[PDB]
Amino acid sequence: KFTAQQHVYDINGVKVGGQPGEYPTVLIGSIFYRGHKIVSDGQKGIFDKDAAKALLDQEAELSAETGNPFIIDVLGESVEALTKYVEFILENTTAPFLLDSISPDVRVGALKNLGKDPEIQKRLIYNSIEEHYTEEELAAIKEAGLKTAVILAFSKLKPNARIDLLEGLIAAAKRAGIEQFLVDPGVLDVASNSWTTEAINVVKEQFGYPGGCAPSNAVYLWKKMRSKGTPFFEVAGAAVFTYPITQGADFILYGPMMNAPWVYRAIATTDAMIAYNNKLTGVKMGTTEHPLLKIF
Amino acid sequence: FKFTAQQHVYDINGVKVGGQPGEYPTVLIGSIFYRGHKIVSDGQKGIFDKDAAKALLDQEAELSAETGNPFIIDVLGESVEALTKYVEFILENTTAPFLLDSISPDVRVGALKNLGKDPEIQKRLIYNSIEEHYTEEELAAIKEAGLKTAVILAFSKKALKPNARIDLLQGLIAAAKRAGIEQFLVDPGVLDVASNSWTTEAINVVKEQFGYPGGCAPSNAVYLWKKMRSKGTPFFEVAGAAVFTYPITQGADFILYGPMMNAPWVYRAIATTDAMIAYNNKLTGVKMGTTEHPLLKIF
Ligand SMILES: CN1c2c(O)nc(N)nc2NC[C@@H]1CNc1ccc(C(=O)N[C@@H](CCC(=O)O)C(=O)O)cc1
Ligand SMILES: CN1c2c(O)nc(N)nc2NC[C@@H]1CNc1ccc(C(=O)N[C@@H](CCC(=O)O)C(=O)O)cc1
């Protein structure tokens, strides 16, 4: 149980945040990532629409099974590609999504192209407000009327240098008109997932913002474990992805959506055990759509 | 160094168990000759496929060498004859310490008599377990054999809540000490998959207050979880990995992971959790007690 009153956000019906055991973990799957084989052209955003739709439908089916809500991590390396990717996601799921590029120019460029349909405001989450945020990003976010952003509380390493960042990143996000802050302290490698999780606990303990991370960042490149094949890679992946949840995290970017079938079953199990602690902490489940009431 | 109490680290025939989080790798305890282990043709006389049994022990040694997770064998028996034969086989076919494991105190004492005095028994045999309703005969049998390590099942129908379970110790530790036990592996018990969170909280209380190595059998309900197991591979294994790694994330020292056939996936999951926990040591100042650790092996 965290000292700070925990912020629970409703993003187009997706609840995220609260005391551990209050709400299920929100699972965030990546689509059109670098080397996503359904993409034939990452510059023009040419991709297999049948394959993309099949991933979105699988996500909805797994979400319905476990009670873990989903937000799509929509990656793009160009304004043209990310715009087409988001247009596809808008039409083919109801889920909220991350507008995700490592380039702030791609993110702002895509935002301008996507326009001012109120569906953008309701579903689009800015990924992310980072250490080197620009006044232009803040102004573009405000002009778009976005209310949720990922805050990437990461620099160049200890949890303390990550909190130092929160003018802070929260103050900057507030200037952009952001009211809902999804705090991501960043993940540098597999081993230091423990450092990230430490930063997550400070965020929830001190501020009560939802806290999460991308434990996916180095796991898929861990060839020594991945080369062992199934189910050895998947249980190692499960250990890494569930670790932040055991330390009270609210959301996980689990990497490529093709991994959803094993990720959801692992994360749902951790959620169920943590919610059983509610009986000792006095925490009330915020929803009956929870792994504890679904997976047994 | 999250626990207040100085943590006991035990050396059981070279297997280190205990410490502060990230100091030592998780000790993994696989079950052999469990009820409906299909390598047993006769559970009453203890007739088993010795080649299949040796293959499991050899696989355990290989996985242990790969990750650095040490191993103790959970030797289950339903009769004095069977458990005697199982322990005689384990003694000759591995160096690993082992749990003398029956739910019947009469079977545990019976097997102890059959095995009798042997410096190997005093070195490697761990009594599984000293329980709420222990008998004076058990304590006298344990002292006669000269055992120095026992599992303490800190569980009662009357003590479901974490604080209540550990209240049994002081008590169960006194009973063990009367039997000449010097090393206590505290197991608060696992009733179901969901209440592993309760078991893990009980492990935290033991380590916080007493500093005894704390562990459990998250295996107890996992293999009977039909809804998840019916999904098959790798869905059952990642769900089982979530259950088995959970106590370790909260500072537990050893896991009874169930049937040894599961060791290939269990070792890879637990080694990963151990590696991440040990990387925290750069911030707490805990010194890894050994270089034979997942953090230095799995990457
Ligand atoms: C960088 N990381 C991240 C983060 O840490 N925080 C936020 N908010 N957003 C993001 N977005 C992107 C990323 C999370 N998503 C990921 C992370 C990693 C991969 C990945 O490893 N892909 C593989 C190829 C796919 C594969 O091997 O299966 C690669 O080698 O690049 C794919 C997607
Ligand atoms: C009860 N539990 C336990 C415990 O909680 N604490 C201690 N110290 N020792 C023990 N020893 C026995 C047990 C831990 N080991 C286990 C737990 C469960 C199983 C198990 O579910 N076996 C089943 C399923 C076999 C299978 O489906 O693979 C069987 O039919 O035998 C097999 C072994």
Numbering used by the authors:
A (entry chain B): 3 to 158, 161 to 170, 177 to 306
B (entry chain A): 2 to 171, 178 to 306
In the authors' words:
Herein, we present X‐ray structures of THF‐ and THF‐CH3‐bound MtgA that allow us atomic insights into the reaction trajectory of this catalyst. In contrast to substrate‐bound MtgA, the entire cofactor is defined in the MtgA:THF‐CH3 complex depicting extensive coordination within the amino acid environment in a rigid manner. The overall binding motif of the pterin ring remains similar to the substrate‐bound structure. However, the THF benzoate moiety is now involved in a π‐stacking network including Tyr230, Phe243, Phe251, and Trp272 on one side, as well as Tyr35 and His38 on the other. While the functional groups of the THF tail engage water‐coupled hydrogen bonding interactions with adjacent residues, the terminal γ‐carboxylate forms salt bridges with Arg236 that coordinate the cofactor in an extended conformation. Mutation of Arg236 to alanine resulted in impaired enzymatic activity, thus implying that fixation of the THF tail during methylation is involved in catalysis. Besides this fixation, the superposition of both ligand structures illustrates a rotation of the pterin moiety during the reaction of approximately 35°. In contrast, the benzoate group of THF‐CH3 displaces the carboxamide side chain of Asn227 by 2 Å (red double arrow). As planar sp2 hybridization would be expected in this position of the final product THF‐CH3, the X‐ray structure must depict a trapped protonated reaction intermediate. On the other hand, the WT MtgA:THF‐CH3 structure illustrates an intermediate that forms immediately after CH3 transfer from Cbl‐CH3 to THF.
During energy production in Desulfitobacterium hafniense, MtgA catalyzes the methyl transfer from methylcobalamin (Cbl‐CH3) to THF in the catabolism of glycine betaine (GB). Despite its lack of sequence identity with known structures, we could show that MtgA forms a homodimeric complex of two TIM barrels. The topology of each subunit is characterized by a funnel of eight parallel β‐sheets connected by α‐helices on the outside that form a complex of two perpendicularly oriented TIM barrels. The active‐site cavity is located inside the hydrophilic core of each barrel.
